[PDB]
């Protein structure tokens, strides 16, 4: 059944709750972003109102074939009324189209649902600064102190410098980047830019990217693989067998592959820095795992919460085990005792 952490008290609203059939008492279904564990269940046969960002709306229309009459896009940073309740969509610094939602309940309670987010100090100067938030529905993906990772900027600097050096030493090397969802487009776009190439990809992935309102996108991507030396492939194909196979497909235009796997966290983060990352190599193929995260590190998450000072925190990730739930509640109490709220 729909879990309690997907329901907004005092409204008939749910958030990211499309896989339970008709939820008894739901008048509006919000969708924070276009990731499959969040949209799971949506299709052309859905006949209830969906509220979301413009970009998420483009993906629902073009990729899932949801009918236009049920898609309700809202602009960001704007007070809107939905079924008698004031709401605001805020940028979540996750993937394109991703939002946090502020609900202003008729009784005076204010609720923030973060969706999936990567907490940033810039959020401390949005509309959130303007009033008190009583309850917080929090992305707790990485809520443990072992989870450190570098800035997105640092990681893109490393990837750009690595690719540029490799291709300048060998003009017949191909760069491949893995993907299985929207998000992390900066990785392949930044590399293609330094090399003076467009990025080449399947027709399905090009269609997905043309939904995202990225400026000058027609100048940056293409379905012609031959004219491009940055290829995108399914994450599944980013291994030696898949990459050897792919190189055969290119008709001897290339003799070397340098590949990137933008992972979340991996336990080499606890020891190693970004400057010291090394690839796995077999033959003329090298594969780099780079820690490009679109979720809060532990310290980023802690700072945001200690700034916001909520009265109650509801986790939305890692909620399925008693050990995980108990651990998270310990951190929340530490944070509150240290900061004094
Ligand atoms: Ni997500």
UniProtKB/Swiss-Prot annotation:
GO terms under biological process: cell division; double-strand break repair via nonhomologous end joining; interstrand cross-link repair
Disulphides: none
Localization per record: Nucleus
Induction: During mitosis. The mRNA encoding this protein contains an internal ribosome entry site (IRES) in its 5'-UTR. This 5'-UTR generally suppresses translation while specifically promoting expression during mitosis, when cap-dependent translation may be impaired.
Tissues where this protein is expressed: Expressed in brain, heart, kidney, liver, pancreas, placenta and skeletal muscle.
GO CC annotation: fibrillar center; nucleoplasm
Keywords: Cell cycle, Cell division, DNA damage, DNA repair, Hydrolase, Isopeptide bond, Metal-binding, Mitosis, Nucleus, Phosphoprotein, Ubl conjugation, Zinc, Zinc-finger
Molecular function via GO: 5'-3' DNA exonuclease activity; beta-lactamase activity; damaged DNA binding; zinc ion binding
Main location: nucleus
Protein role: May be required for DNA interstrand cross-link repair. Also required for checkpoint mediated cell cycle arrest in early prophase in response to mitotic spindle poisons. Possesses beta-lactamase activity, catalyzing the hydrolysis of penicillin G and nitrocefin. Exhibits no activity towards other beta-lactam antibiotic classes including cephalosporins (cefotaxime) and carbapenems (imipenem).
Subunit and partners: Binds constitutively to TP53BP1. Binds CDC27, which is itself a component of the anaphase promoting complex (APC). Binds PIAS1.
Family recorded in the similarity comment: Belongs to the DNA repair metallo-beta-lactamase (DRMBL) family.
The protein, known as: DNA cross-link repair 1A protein
